């Protein structure tokens, strides 16, 4: 009877999200390889890359959300998909070209050639990231709410499945692309990424059209200029009832306590090897999946607004271990310090992902449909704004005493975000 389930719009949404997330992770891995290789030992350009991406989203999120609000759903979805995939394909061709001629670019040309290659790569990657943000808004904040009926358990299960998909992709995609870059060449990996995006674009295009055909309600939308739209969107975001919950979710991005950040190099400094690091990342993904399961259970039990409180309490309770580990023997501010630090990180993943699922469902339940895009656009502009701040703090303080300082700062930001959520929750109830 799976032949019936495999043709439902819900599974088609899951499949398209899986393809998009896989391609996006392989693309981010290729860009990281390009930055580490052709621009190592440079600090100005890493900061420029992060600043360009985060500041473009910070300036254009309300504009992209208004564009999603003002147009037909199938049009904006297929347009965002085509723009993102064509950008990644062209940038991957350019990347394999610069990887083929790496030592010539480093040794026997004027430096403006390599500078122009960097400028072109950063620009095309910025365009692809803006298209990915438009896709995330239109699909995970609009289409999924429509494919779910009025039912809230269905929306919750769909959000949890989407989170499990990206939790698995976050560990699996980098492994595959790195094995392709060792068993072959980085040129081979860039060509594979370009071909993967070229095929996945067509498959996801047909998948979006099929979901649009199976969901008639998607065809029924409810209804200098750019500066006025920007100001109106930010003022509309400030006056939302769920504004404090979104502010706390954005404050959660100002953190160092994860395996995507500089904790990996700190673990190398503390004597752990790469196999232990892979085991810890796998345990972290396991705890994130456990957090999705805990979100569905607690939402069935205590409701959504209390699920957010319980998730924030769990996350702070697990970060207490990191706070203690910074003040323990073997801290460079013995195995006892890193043990408590990584134990707190892996344990806090549960409450982190439960709280993220909670704020996501609050945003998609309590925002007016005609405002669904622009509000979420400003929400993206908030998240990146606190991500970019972390991206600065890590760059200016890259030595081990600063690691403990940054850990204390990240725990304080997590506490500030949960305090804002507690204010919203005490207001709501």
């Amino acid at each position: 009877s799976l032949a019936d389930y495999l043709t439902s719009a819900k599974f088609l949404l899951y499949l398209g999200h899986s393809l998009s997330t896989w391609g996006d992770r392989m693309w981010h891995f290729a860009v990281s390889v390009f930055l580490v290789e052709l621009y190592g030992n440079s600090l100005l350009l890493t900061a420029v890359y992060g600043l360009v991406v985060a500041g473009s989203v910070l300036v254009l999120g309300a504009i992209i959300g208004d564009w999603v609000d003002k147009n037909a759903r199938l049009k904006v979805a297929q347009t965002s998909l085509v723009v993102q995939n064509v950008s990644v394909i062209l940038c991957g061709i350019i990347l394999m070209m610069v990887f083929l001629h790496k030592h010539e670019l480093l040794t026997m040309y004027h430096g403006w050639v390599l500078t122009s290659c960097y400028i072109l790569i950063i620009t095309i990657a910025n365009i692809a990231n803006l298209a990915s943000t438009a896709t995330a808004i239109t699909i995970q904040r609009d289409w999924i709410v429509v494919v779910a009926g009025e039912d809230r358990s269905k929306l919750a299960n769909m959000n949890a499945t989407i989170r499990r998909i990206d939790q698995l992709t976050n560990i699996l995609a980098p492994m595959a692309v790195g094995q392709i870059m060792t068993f072959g060449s980085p040129v081979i990996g860039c060509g594979f990424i370009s071909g993967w995006n070229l095929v996945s674009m067509c498959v996801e295009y047909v998948l979006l059209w099929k979901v649009y055909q199976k969901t008639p309600a998607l065809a029924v939308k409810a209804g200098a200029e750019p500066f006025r739209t920007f100001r109106d969107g930010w003022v509309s975001y400030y006056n939302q009832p769920v504004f404090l919950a979104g502010m706390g979710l954005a404050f959660l991005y100002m953190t160092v306590l994860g395996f995507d950040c500089i904790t990996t190099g700190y673990a190398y400094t503390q004597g752990l090897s790469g196999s232990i690091l892979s085991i810890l990342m796998g345990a972290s993904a396991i705890t994130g999946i456990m957090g999705t399961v805990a979100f569905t259970w607690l939402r069935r039990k205590c409701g959504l607004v209390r699920t957010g409180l319980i998730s924030g309490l769990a996350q702070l309770s697990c970060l207490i271990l990191c706070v203690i580990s910074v003040f323990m023997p073997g801290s460079p501010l013995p195995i006892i310090s890193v043990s408590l630090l990584f134990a707190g990180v892996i344990a806090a993943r549960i409450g982190l992902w439960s709280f993220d699922l909670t704020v996501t469902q609050l945003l998609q339940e309590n925002v007016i449909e005609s405002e669904r895009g622009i509000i979420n656009g400003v929400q993206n502009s908030m998240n990146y704004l606190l991500d970019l701040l972390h991206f600065i703090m890590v760059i200016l303080a890259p030595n081990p005493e600063a690691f403990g300082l940054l850990v204390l700062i990240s725990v304080s930001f997590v506490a500030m975000g949960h305090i804002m959520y507690f204010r919203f929750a005490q207001n709501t109830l």
Partner: antibody
Amino acid sequence: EVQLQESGPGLAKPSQTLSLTCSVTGSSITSDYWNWIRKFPGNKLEYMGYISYSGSTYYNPSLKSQISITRDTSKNHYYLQLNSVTTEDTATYYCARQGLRNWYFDVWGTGTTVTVSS
Amino acid sequence: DIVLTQSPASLPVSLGQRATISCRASKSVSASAYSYMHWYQQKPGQPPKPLIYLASNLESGVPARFSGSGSGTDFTLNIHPVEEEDAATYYCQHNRELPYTFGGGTKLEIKR
């Protein structure tokens, strides 16, 4: 299994032109960099220049000799001509590949020795 | 041009001991993640054969006894343990910019 092989005359008189050939097998001279190097009586190795996969050439400007580097893609050979030689061009001459995914002298010929004297 | 200064010009070493050959550049040879120093071995009558490239990569077939290190302007080739067959002349060579230039050579002699 790339192989290079130098050939040319063993003796040249002062003020004549000398032309050496590097014959390449196992790989096409249209992919990498193709260099000339010589070793003087003594231990001193001197880079002379290259011709590239695209037919672009570079000559070491610190040379006291005037040289031309050319190639023939239908034979997969390339060539070094030295104009008006002197006694100080007496040397052992090597051709060598430099790869794009390597960036050093990863394959060498065995060398041919030339004496300039009247 | 960039000038490469090898040291010592002649190195006598008893079998089984270690040999240390150094090479110093007038300017840096590192660009980005790489270092453009390479090491070659030449025995008499033979052409030079590559030993270590990008200043720490082992050429295929080269015994593990050979290793390299360094960065910027200072580089070192190490041979531990030395064997009879290493009696030979070793050269450093930079690739950072044109014209390419070689160090003056270090002849490795087996001390009696």
